[PDB]
Write a protein that binds this ligand. Sequence first.
Ligand SMILES: C[Se@@+](CC[C@H](N)C(=O)O)C[C@H]1O[C@@H](n2cnc3c(N)ncnc32)[C@H](O)[C@@H]1O
Ligand code: SF4
Length: 340
Amino acid sequence: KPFVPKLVYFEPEALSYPLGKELYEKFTQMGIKIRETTSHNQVRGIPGETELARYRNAKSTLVVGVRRTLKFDSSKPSAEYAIPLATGCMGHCHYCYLQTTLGSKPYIRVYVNLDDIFAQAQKYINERAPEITRFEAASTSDIVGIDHLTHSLKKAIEFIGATDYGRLRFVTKYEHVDHLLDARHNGKTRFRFSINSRYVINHFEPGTSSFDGRLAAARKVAGAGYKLGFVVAPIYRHEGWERGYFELFQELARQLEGMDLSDLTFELIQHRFTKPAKRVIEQRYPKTRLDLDETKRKYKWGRYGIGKYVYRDEEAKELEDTMRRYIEQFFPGAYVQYFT
Ligand SMILES: C[Se@@+](CC[C@H](N)C(=O)O)C[C@H]1O[C@@H](n2cnc3c(N)ncnc32)[C@H](O)[C@@H]1O
Ligand code: SF4
């Protein structure tokens, strides 16, 4: 509010880059505890005697490192590629799918070699030009929520804005967007916000900005000329979900009335969870009301990893049809990019 870490790790090589140097100067000036780590993927000594303590303390830890990977992962259906600027999040969403992603770490990571990263991005753009290449910057982090510390996203926005065939997009649950409002985005960045029913936000999204805060930020970014979008996710069949999601879209329309919404986009993602999710989530959030009963679900098998549970076809279809009705009612001429 906005996020500031209570412990910072640096890779020694990180100090060779402007961002690493800048962050070391900032955090030493603030008197924050700073440690050294050989790799940002191998961070040792995070305080805590229990698993819950170590998890919660990791969520208050920042790790400053060099990105050595290299190839960008695909990010379909959002975008062609995930541009890697950060990994991890300070938020505590009970359902967060990043918790059980292969190789995910609970701490927040930021990468300092932006020249390298943007160079590789340009390479991907050139490989496909004159076709457009889209980059997702919040695939494995809340890149916006972290950004006031680094301005790495602001730099990426302006990098992409300068390109002819590159486009950028990202989604956030945080309202701390003021430093991004004067960025030279050149119309090539889609600024999105995660929204949900009152039930889901109140019960499952602690440590994030409120709905009203997210909408205040949305009006700001739209007013600064960014393309605006919303991601309705996770779509979760809680008791009274039909009316809950009806009221979401009704309230969303009221909070955006007056504004031009001719190019507004919606993305719909149903709640999914993996086989190890129940054990992990119940350890980290003992009092959660999140239902992870796999017997009511359909399993989608993994390809190179493990798969996940989604709602059954009938219930998934019901969710999709209902969401599409609401968007048609309150946002005629808004585009629904996908339901998954
Ligand atoms: C990985 Se989230 C990273 C970006 C940012 N920190 C944010 O929260 O918007 C990206 C989206 O995915 C959703 N999401 C998270 N977990 C799940 C899930 N388990 N099932 C279904 N959806 C899940 C979140 O609500 C987001 O809309
Ligand atoms: S804000 Fe996004 S990345 Fe952070 S815990 Fe919530 S879903 Fe996960």
